[PDB]
Amino acid sequence: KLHDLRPARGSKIARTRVGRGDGSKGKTAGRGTKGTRARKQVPVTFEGGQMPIHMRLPKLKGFRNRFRTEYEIVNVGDINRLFPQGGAVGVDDLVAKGAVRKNALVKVLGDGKLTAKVDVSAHKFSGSARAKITAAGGSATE
C-alpha cells in the first residue's frame, strides 16, 4: 500500500538551509569573510587582472570545414558479433539491429577479424574493412 512505501536509504538527502543558527552553518553560510565572495560571486573568467588562461593562450590553429562529411561507423569485428550467421546485411539492417543511428551515411571500420560469411552494403569502406570483409568470403559494396 502507500503506508508501506519508502525510497532506498541513500537518496532523499537533507537540504542544507544555511543561515540557521551557529550550530549547523550559522552566520556566514560558507562565505566566511567580508570579502567580495561574501556578498556576490566572482566569475570563472576573472583571474585577478592578469590575462586569464583563456586570453593568454592562442586560439587553436586551423578552421572548421563547413562541409565536414561526418559518417557513422560500424565495427567489422562487432559486425561479426552483431550477425553470427549474417549472409545478408545492409545499412538499414544495421539501424534495424541497432548498430548505428538513422539518417546516416555509414563507414565500416576494421577492428577485429570478421569471421562470418557476410556481404556488407555501406558507403566508404576503409582499407582493413574491405580486406577483412572480402576475405570472409563475402565482399564490400557501395
Binding site: V44, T45, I53, H54, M55, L57, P58, K59, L60, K61
Partner: protein
C-alpha cells in the same frame, strides 16, 4: 535557462578522445628569430592542461 559556453576558451581548448583538455603551447607566434629551434620544438604542439588550470577550464568549456 540554457548555459552558455564561453566562446573565447572553446576556441583555445580542445577536449581530446578522452577526458583531456589540450591547450596550445604557443608563445610561438610573434618573434621566432632569436628563438632557437629548440625553443620552438619546445613551443610546437598541444599540451595537456595541468591540474592547477583544469577545474576552471572545463567550466569555460561548458
Amino acid at each position: 535557462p540554457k548555459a552558455k559556453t564561453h566562446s573565447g576558451a572553446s576556441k583555445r581548448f580542445r577536449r581530446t578522445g578522452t577526458g583531456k583538455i589540450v591547450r596550445q603551447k604557443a608563445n610561438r607566434r610573434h618573434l621566432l628569430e632569436h628563438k632557437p629551434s629548440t625553443r620552438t620544438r619546445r613551443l610546437d604542439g598541444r599540451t595537456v592542461v595541468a591540474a592547477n588550470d583544469t577545474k576552471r577550464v572545463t567550466s569555460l568549456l561548458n
